[PDB]
Design a binder for this molecule. Structure first.
Ligand code: NAD
Ligand code: NAD
Ligand code: UD2
Ligand code: UD2
Lengths: 336, 336
């Protein structure tokens, strides 16, 4: 069990608060929405359906009662517009800021669009929240922020030079957050996600992350490409661990705020092994090419999550094999 | 003698190039305009007359030949618009990016707009230049990036935490720049100015810099305010030194690109001493109160300019007293 997490969720049910989820129509945002409505929370969602999907909201609506669903207010809109951000902040207690453009390659082909959404939009949401004086502000940061820094495992204090325009944006979020605390006293929590996966992670289009991409390729019978030697490694973190950290963060005591936390499992998996993992799990459910390293790619990534453990009482409970067993049926269904 | 600068300038005159100056109606941009046209360069100018002035363009036109002036194309427009940045990039060899909203206090009261001009506009200009395959790209960075770092003097590798949104913006300009060399092989020079002063630094405005502010204050018999105990200390940099460094950076040897340079004189003057220096200097042309420290003001600032002296053959020629001597009659002219 996850017990400070199980305490808090109980508390939420007994006295529901008002949550803003930006990027509510995406992977992590729709999983947050699914958990929060199942706890009877009031939830304001904001999304421009850029990379998200109206069908992600349709699926969540099939997972909760009509009464629970009636507590969700959705605004179609864009974090780049400050007014929009001020409007959705009205009466919000806790901010979970997930809206961003992901993908390192997307950011290399088009750094401008990546900047607008991840810096302008990020600062817009942050400033509006500062001004509405919400109770908490938790935002999606990134393991890419570790950069060319070689030390292993990854510890919050120790970062490198960013390796791509995407990594620049997610780092700038931490800097803006820390200057906002210093200048205004508005104390936030940044969450350095490491390679999140699970249900509703988009398998389509050029920018799919490796798990839904390879899972889909193997189901279709498409080539599976490993960019590089395949010893590149990641801390693959199943969605429920991320859902836990967001909620622990929103209800954190003040002293644990103005802090950055690695969100992961402490494990290390190469693309070669992963490929074995995806194939094996899929196969119990029933039904490869090497090429160049990808540009601006981080080489080795393994979180040290002692800090989240000690300070937020995080329990990292689902590891990659189990996470994948939980994920694959959603994929098989979704794709056929 | 500024021997390398001399030789670089003889190169330009025999083989004129096309330059873009953003921020060209402003203090530093109009001073770069003056020199470059004096070298018979072709110059494209961009400005939105936010902090800049048409009267600065009017003065430059009195200072250069008609033949020289004919090679200046002024375009009013805004670096926040990409299409505009792409347009003025056409046939550009050397990029001098000065357009931004300065002032630390302005960034604390309006972090949104500063971000747009100073992060969005900066990325817009940098991306257009990469795309147009210009020969060089030199941009205005800031000594405010040293932040809370205690060590004196300031050397480029050692910075601390930014104290203002403004410092965040200039620091992000450096990170984007280094990510462009890494990702696109597009090599930039970032210049961290330390408190530049000279002809055409604006004395009017709630955000006027200390030297034009105090000069105007003293001439009107108005109150001179010290924000602090007066022991706040700076490396005050007369404008010609900055002009020398932009020109040396634009024709830098390749190995000296993808680098950040302090741009000062290496001296240290407290606010208490400056007030006496201005007064004495003014007093030869014949005509204090303490309040609170200013929020997120850097305490103490002295540049180590060894890396410029070494890598670029920068030769700073004008220190504070002489630079005040040269500037004082400009201000008497302006305000009369
Ligand atoms: N998936 C991961 O491994 C991972 C890793 C590190 C960081 N992150 C970060 O997690 C956050 C969410 O990622 P995700 O995996 O859920 O991606 P996603 O693309 O599935 O979700 C992003 C959501 O934000 C929305 N969005 C984008 N720009 C917007 C804008 N300008 N206005 C309003 N909505 C906008 C998209 O429509 C989408 O619904 C992002 O901040 C991302 O950088 C994810
Ligand atoms: N004053 C200093 O000592 C110092 C120190 C470090 C960095 N800098 C930087 O030096 C550069 C120039 O500063 P300055 O002292 O010349 O200030 P300034 O305000 O006199 O000049 C800046 C110019 O940029 C123009 N501008 C601003 N935003 C624009 C936009 N969106 N579109 C088009 N034009 C725009 C303004 O109209 C102005 O003419 C800036 O990057 C500033 O941040 C200055
Ligand atoms: C360690 C790190 O920086 N992680 C960040 C980075 O994820 P990654 O860029 O690491 O996410 P990803 O799933 O896109 O790639 C993982 C790895 O698998 C490789 N690959 C991918 C597809 C393929 O067909 N074949 C293949 O080999 C890819 O080159 C990379 O080495 O960006 C994400 C947002 O987008 C998150 O911010 C992550 O925190
Ligand atoms: C050390 C530092 O970070 N310098 C940067 C900072 O300059 P500064 O903000 O230091 O420039 P400034 O002239 O505005 O301020 C100079 C100093 O004088 C003080 N003061 C100012 C006005 C007054 O009426 N009385 C008074 O005492 C002020 O509080 C500060 O301590 O920002 C600039 C852009 O805006 C440049 O980036 C400089 O590189």
């Amino acid at each position: 069990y996850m017990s400070r997490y199980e305490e808090i969720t109980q508390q939420l049910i007994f006295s529901p608060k008002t949550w803003l989820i930006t990027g509510v129509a995406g992977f992590i945002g729709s999983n947050l929405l699914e958990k929060l409505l199942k706890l009877n929370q009031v939830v304001i969602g904001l999304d421009n359906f850029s990379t998200g999907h109206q069908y992600n909201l349709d699926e969540v609506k099939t997972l909760v009662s009509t009464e629970q669903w009636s507590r969700f207010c959705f605004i179609e809109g864009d974090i780049r517009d400050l007014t929009t951000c001020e409007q959705v902040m009205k009466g919000v207690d806790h901010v979970l800021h997930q809206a961003a453009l992901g993908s390192v390659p997307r950011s290399i082909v088009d750094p401008i669009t990546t900047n607008a959404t991840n810096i302008t939009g990020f600062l817009n949401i942050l400033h509006a929240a500062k001004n509405a004086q919400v109770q908490s502000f938790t935002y999606a940061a990134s393991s890419s922020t570790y950069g060319d820094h070689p030390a292993l495992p990854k510890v919050e204090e120790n970062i490198g030079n960013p390796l791509s325009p995407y990594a620049v944006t997610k780092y700038v979020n931490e800097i803006y957050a820390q200057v906002y605390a210093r200048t205004y006293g508005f104390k936030t929590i940044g969450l350095r996600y490491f390679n999140v996966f699970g249900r509703r992670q988009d398998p389509n289009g050029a920018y799919a992350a490796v798990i839904p991409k390879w899972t889909a390729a193997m189901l279709k019978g498409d080539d599976v490409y490993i960019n590089g030697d395949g010893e590149t490694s990641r801390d693959f973190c199943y969605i429920d661990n991320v859902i836990q950290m967001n909620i622990l963060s929103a209800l954190a005591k003040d002293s644990a705020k103005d802090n950055i936390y690695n969100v992961a499992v402490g494990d290390r998996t190469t693309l070669n092994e992963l490929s074995g993992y995806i194939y094996d799990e899929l196969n119990l459910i029933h039904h490869i090419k090497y090429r160049e390293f990808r540009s601006g790619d981080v080489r080795a990534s393994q979180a040290d999550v002692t800090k989240a453990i000690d300070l937020l009482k995080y329990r990292p409970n689902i590891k990659i094999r189990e996470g994948l067993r939980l994920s694959m049926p959603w994929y098989v269904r979704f794709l056929k």
